[PDB]
Design a protein around this ligand. Sequence first.
Ligand SMILES: *[C@@H]1O[C@H](CO)[C@@H](O[C@@H]2O[C@H](CO)[C@@H](O)[C@H](O)[C@H]2NC(C)=O)[C@H](O)[C@H]1NC(C)=O
Ligand SMILES: *[C@@H]1O[C@H](CO)[C@@H](O[C@@H]2O[C@H](CO)[C@@H](O)[C@H](O)[C@H]2NC(C)=O)[C@H](O)[C@H]1NC(C)=O
Ligand SMILES: *[C@@H]1O[C@H](CO)[C@@H](O[C@@H]2O[C@H](CO)[C@@H](O)[C@H](O)[C@H]2NC(C)=O)[C@H](O)[C@H]1NC(C)=O
Ligand SMILES: *[C@@H]1O[C@H](CO)[C@@H](O[C@@H]2O[C@H](CO)[C@@H](O)[C@H](O)[C@H]2NC(C)=O)[C@H](O)[C@H]1NC(C)=O
Ligand code: NAG
Ligand code: NAG
Ligand code: NAG
Ligand code: NAG
Ligand code: NAG
Ligand code: NAG
Ligand code: NAG
Ligand code: NAG
Ligand code: NAG
Ligand code: NAG
Lengths: 50, 246, 239, 149, 142, 50
Amino acid sequence: LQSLQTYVTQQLIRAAEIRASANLAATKMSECVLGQSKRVDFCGKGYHLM
Amino acid sequence: MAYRFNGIGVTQNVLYENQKLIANQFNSAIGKIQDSLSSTPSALGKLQDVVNHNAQALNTLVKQLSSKFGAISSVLNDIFSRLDPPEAEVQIDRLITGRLQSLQTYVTQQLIRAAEIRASANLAATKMSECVLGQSKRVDFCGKGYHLMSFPQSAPHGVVFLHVTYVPAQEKNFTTAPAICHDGKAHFPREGVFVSNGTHWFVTQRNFYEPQIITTDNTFVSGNCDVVIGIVNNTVYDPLQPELDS
Amino acid sequence: NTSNQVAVLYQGVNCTEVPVAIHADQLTPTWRVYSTGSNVFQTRAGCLIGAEYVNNSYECDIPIGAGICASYQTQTSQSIIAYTMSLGAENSVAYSNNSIAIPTNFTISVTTEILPVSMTKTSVDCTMYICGDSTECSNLLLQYGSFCTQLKRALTGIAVEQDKNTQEVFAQVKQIYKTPPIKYFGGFNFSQILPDPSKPSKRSPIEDLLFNKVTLADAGFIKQYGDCLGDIAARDLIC
Amino acid sequence: FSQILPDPSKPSKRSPIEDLLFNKVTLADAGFIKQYGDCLGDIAARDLICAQKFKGLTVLPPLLTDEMIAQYTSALLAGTITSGWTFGAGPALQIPFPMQMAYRFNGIGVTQNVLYENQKLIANQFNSAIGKIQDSLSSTPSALGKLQD
Amino acid sequence: NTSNQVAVLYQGVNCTEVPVAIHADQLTPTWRVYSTGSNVFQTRAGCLIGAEYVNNSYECDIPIGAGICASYQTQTKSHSQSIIAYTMSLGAENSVAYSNNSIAIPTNFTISVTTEILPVSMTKTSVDCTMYICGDSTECSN
Amino acid sequence: VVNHNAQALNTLVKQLSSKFGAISSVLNDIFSRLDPPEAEVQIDRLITGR
Ligand SMILES: *[C@@H]1O[C@H](CO)[C@@H](O[C@@H]2O[C@H](CO)[C@@H](O)[C@H](O)[C@H]2NC(C)=O)[C@H](O)[C@H]1NC(C)=O
Ligand SMILES: *[C@@H]1O[C@H](CO)[C@@H](O[C@@H]2O[C@H](CO)[C@@H](O)[C@H](O)[C@H]2NC(C)=O)[C@H](O)[C@H]1NC(C)=O
Ligand SMILES: *[C@@H]1O[C@H](CO)[C@@H](O[C@@H]2O[C@H](CO)[C@@H](O)[C@H](O)[C@H]2NC(C)=O)[C@H](O)[C@H]1NC(C)=O
Ligand SMILES: *[C@@H]1O[C@H](CO)[C@@H](O[C@@H]2O[C@H](CO)[C@@H](O)[C@H](O)[C@H]2NC(C)=O)[C@H](O)[C@H]1NC(C)=O
Ligand SMILES: *[C@@H]1O[C@H](CO)[C@@H](O)[C@H](O)[C@H]1NC(C)=O
Ligand SMILES: *[C@@H]1O[C@H](CO)[C@@H](O)[C@H](O)[C@H]1NC(C)=O
Ligand SMILES: *[C@@H]1O[C@H](CO)[C@@H](O)[C@H](O)[C@H]1NC(C)=O
Ligand SMILES: *[C@@H]1O[C@H](CO)[C@@H](O)[C@H](O)[C@H]1NC(C)=O
Ligand SMILES: *[C@@H]1O[C@H](CO)[C@@H](O)[C@H](O)[C@H]1NC(C)=O
Ligand SMILES: *[C@@H]1O[C@H](CO)[C@@H](O)[C@H](O)[C@H]1NC(C)=O
Ligand SMILES: *[C@@H]1O[C@H](CO)[C@@H](O)[C@H](O)[C@H]1NC(C)=O
Ligand SMILES: *[C@@H]1O[C@H](CO)[C@@H](O)[C@H](O)[C@H]1NC(C)=O
Ligand SMILES: *[C@@H]1O[C@H](CO)[C@@H](O)[C@H](O)[C@H]1NC(C)=O
Ligand SMILES: *[C@@H]1O[C@H](CO)[C@@H](O)[C@H](O)[C@H]1NC(C)=O
C-alpha cells in the first residue's frame, strides 16, 4: 500500500509543472501569432515580424 | 468614449456622428446578460466544484474512522476493558499508526490544492490590474475582438468580468495598388491604402470605409517611378492652385 | 433521470475473445447479451458493444477515445449513437494579386468571464480525533513525538494565505468614491450594474441574481451548542 | 513557402519538417498500445510495454489523434499567409502579401517606402534562412532534449 | 517588549457559559478570575474578554475575524494604556463633482522612485540515509 | 527564505529523541541488554518511525 501512495503523490506534483508550461504556450499562440507584439524579446531576439 | 476609439485605428469623427445608434446597441447588449446566465445550468460550474471538493474530502475522513487496521476491534474502550497491559500496547500501536498515517494524506492534498488556487488568484489579479484600469492591445487577452472597457462584479469565492468589444460586420470588395505615379515622381500614402471603385481613386482608413480626395496634404514623396512593382499612373491634386489663380 | 439503456466498452482486447465469458461459467461478471454481438464496433482503445454506428458528423458531447464519441438522440424511438468527431465548419478564401476587402459597418458585443479567488478555511484538532476522550490514550500518544506540533503550522499556512489573496486582489485603489446623485450620462444606461438604493442591502441586480445560483454550504455559527439535541435530533451532517 | 505547407503527395499530409521532428524523437515503443493477443508470443522485440500489463498498470490512448492535430495546425498557416491578423477577431478578409509585410515594417517605426524599394533583395535572403533550418535540426540531436525527458 | 496585558478569545460560543465553556472551576484561581467576564464583547466569530469596544475608526493591525481588529492605545483615557477592539475602516471618503461640459488638466509634474524585492533561489541541501538511520551499528547494516 | 528552511532542518534532529514506544531511545542499549531472538520485535518500531 505504501509503495503505491508515494508514486501517486509524485505524479500530482509533476502535473502542476506541465500545466504551468502549457498555460504559457497558449498565450504565445495568441500574442506572437494572430497579431504583432511589442513586448521586448518575448518571442525571438530583436524585433518581431512573424 | 471617443478617446477609447482613437486607440484602435478608428478616426475620432466616427463616434460623434453615430451616437444614438451606439447607445441603443449597447443597451440592447446589456439587456441579454440575465437570460444568458439563466439559460445554462453550468453557468457557474467553475465556482461550484471549488466548494464541492472541500465539502467532500472531509466527509471521507470521518468515514475513515471505521477501519480496524488489523486489530480485533474498532472502538478503543473495548481494547482497554477486555485485555491486559502486557499486550494492550501492541494492540494500540496498530490503530495509532494507522490514524496518524491517514491524517497526513489530507494535509498534503490540501497543500497542493491551495498551491493551485494561489496561481489562479494571481492571474485574476493581473487581469483586474490591466483590463479595467486602462486599455490593452494584447489580442485575445481580454475578450474576443478589440477591447474597449470592462466592469467587475463579485460572487461567492470569485469574480465575474463583463468585457465590451467592437467587431466589424459587413465587408466589400475593392481593387488596390501599392503606390501611385506622377510626373516621374512616386507618391505614397501617409496612412491607409489606395482604393479604386473602377472609376476614380481615393484613400481611406484601414477599418472603416470613408473616401476622401487624393491631395498633397496626406501623401509624401520618395524614390522615383522606376523600381516599385505594380505602380499605376494617375493625376495629383494641389490645394494651392485654385487659391493662387487670383 | 432520462432513460435506462446502457453500453459497454471492453478495454484494449480483441472482442472475439469476449465470448469466453459465460453466464453459467465460474465468473463474477456474467452478463448474457453484451457477451455476444448483434451490432459491435472496434476502436484502437478496445471494443464497443451496444452502440449503433452513424456516418453523419456532429460536435460530440462525451468522449471515449481514438476520436470516437457517443451521444443520445432521437434517431428512429431513440437509441445511443457513436460517431467520429467533426472538426468544424469549413470555408475558403479568394486570394488574388491585387484585390482587397474592407468593412463598412460595425457592431458592439459584451462577453462574460468567471474566475475563482480563494478556498474555504479549515482547522483540525490533533488529540480529540485520535483518542476520543480516552484517558491513557493521551499518555501513549505523548511518546511518539511532535506530529501534533507541526500539523497546526502546516494548516495555519493556508489559513493565513487565504486572506492575503483576497486582500491583494480587491485593494488596488485607496480612496472610496461614489456616483453623483444624477444618473444621466448622455444616452447610455447603467441601471443594471450600479447598486440599487431601494434594496435593504447594498447590492446590484446582477450580483443578486448570482448569489442565488450557487448552493453555499451551511454556516452562520450564531449558536451551536445543543442544537442537534432538540428538534434536530435527526442529525445533520454539520454537527 | 513550400517548406512549411502540407504536401498532398505524402500519405498523411505531414510537412517535411514534421517528418524530421517525428523521426528524431524516439518513443518508448514503435506502437502506443500492445493489444491482448499481440504479446502471446515472446518475441525478442517485446519490451516492458506489455510485460507489466499483467499487474494492472495500463496506458490509454489520447483523445485527439495526430492527424487531427495536423489538420488544426495547417489551418493557422493557411489563415496567416492569406488574411493577415484580421481573422483572429471576426470575418476573414483577404489582402495581398506585400502590403501585409509593409504593415509589419510600419509597426516598428520604419517608413514603408523601404520595403517597396528593396523587395527582390529581401526574398533572396528569406528563402536562404528556411533552407538552413533543416540542417540545424540534423547536425546534433541536443536541440530536442526536453521532449525526451 | 512593551507591556504585559493580554486578551482571550473564545471561538464560536455563546460564552454566557464561560465557566462551562472551559471548566475553570477546577483550574487555577487566576484563570478562574479571568473567566469572570469583567467586560465581554460579542463577535460573529465568538467572544472576546479583556478589551473595550470603541466607536471610533482606524486602519487595523491585528486581524481577529468578521471585520474586527484590535490594537494598543493610550489617548482614550487621561493617560493607563490599554487594549481596544474596533470595526475596521476602509479609508477617507471622497467624491468628484461630475459635470458634462467641464474637465481638468495638470500644470506641474513630479518624479518618484520606488522599490521592489523578489526571491530567486533557496539553499541547497543533501541527506545520507544509512548514517542517519542508525549511526554506526553493523546490525543495522544487515 | 533563509528562516523557514533552517527551522525545517532543526526539527528533524529533535525527532531523533522520541522513543516510539520502544524500551529505550539509545540504539546500543537494546543490543547490549536483550537477546538476538527478541530484539527484532523492538528494532522495527524505531526503523519505521524514522
Ligand atoms: C449597421 O447595420 C445595422 C444592422 O445591424 C443597421 O442598424 C439599423 O438601425 C436602425 C436604427 O436603430 C434600425 O431601425 C434598423 O433596423 C437597423 N438595421 C437592421 C438591419 O436592423 C445600420 O445599417 C448600421 N448601423 C450602424 C450603427 O452603423
Ligand atoms: C468579396 O470577397 C469575398 C471574400 O473574398 C467573396 O466571398 C466569397 O468568394 C468566393 C470566391 O471563391 C465565392 O465562391 C463565395 O461564393 C463568396 N461568398 C461567400 C459567402 O463565401 C465575395 O464573393 C466577394 N464579393 C462580394 C460581393 O461579397
Ligand atoms: C435601463 O435599462 C433597464 C433595463 O433594460 C430599465 O429597467 C427596466 O425598465 C422596463 C421599462 O421599459 C421595466 O419593465 C423593467 O422592469 C425594468 N427593469 C429593471 C431591472 O429595472 C431602465 O428603465 C433603463 N433606464 C432608462 C433611464 O431607460
Ligand atoms: C512645480 O513644482 C516644483 C516643486 O517641486 C517647483 O519647484 C520649486 O519651485 C520653487 C519656486 O521657485 C523653488 O524655490 C524651488 O527651489 C523649486 N524646487 C523644489 C524642489 O522645491 C516648480 O517651480 C513648479 N513649477 C513651476 C513652473 O513653477
Ligand atoms: C465610382 O465612384 C464615382 C464617384 O463619383 C462614381 O461617379 C462612379 O459611378 C463609381 N463607379 C463605380 C463602378 O462604382
Ligand atoms: C503611365 O503613364 C506614364 C506617363 O508618365 C507612362 O510613361 C507609362 O508607360 C504609363 N503606364 C501605363 C501602364 O500605361
Ligand atoms: C428529470 O427529468 C424530468 C423529466 O424528464 C425533469 O422534469 C427534471 O427536471 C429532471 N431532473 C432534473 C434535476 O433536472
Ligand atoms: C482480431 O480478431 C480478428 C478475428 O475476429 C482478426 O481478424 C484480427 O486480425 C484480430 N486483430 C488483433 C489485433 O488481434
Ligand atoms: C457509412 O459509410 C460506410 C462507408 O462508406 C458504409 O459502408 C455504411 O453503409 C454507411 N452507413 C450507412 C448507414 O449507410
Ligand atoms: C500574379 O502576378 C504574377 C507575377 O507577378 C503572375 O505570375 C501570376 O499569374 C499573377 N496571378 C494573378 C491571379 O493575377
Ligand atoms: C448566542 O448569540 C447570538 C448572537 O446574535 C444570539 O442571537 C443568541 O440568542 C445567543 N444565544 C443565547 C442562548 O443567548
Ligand atoms: C456608540 O455607538 C452605538 C451605536 O450607534 C451607540 O448606541 C452608542 O451610544 C455610542 N456610544 C457613544 C458614547 O456615543
Ligand atoms: C474644479 O471643479 C471641481 C468640480 O468639477 C471642483 O470640485 C474643484 O473645487 C474646482 N477647482 C477649484 C480650484 O475650485
Ligand atoms: C448637461 O447636463 C445638464 C443637467 O441635466 C443638462 O441640462 C444638459 O442638457 C446636459 N448637456 C447636454 C449637452 O445634454
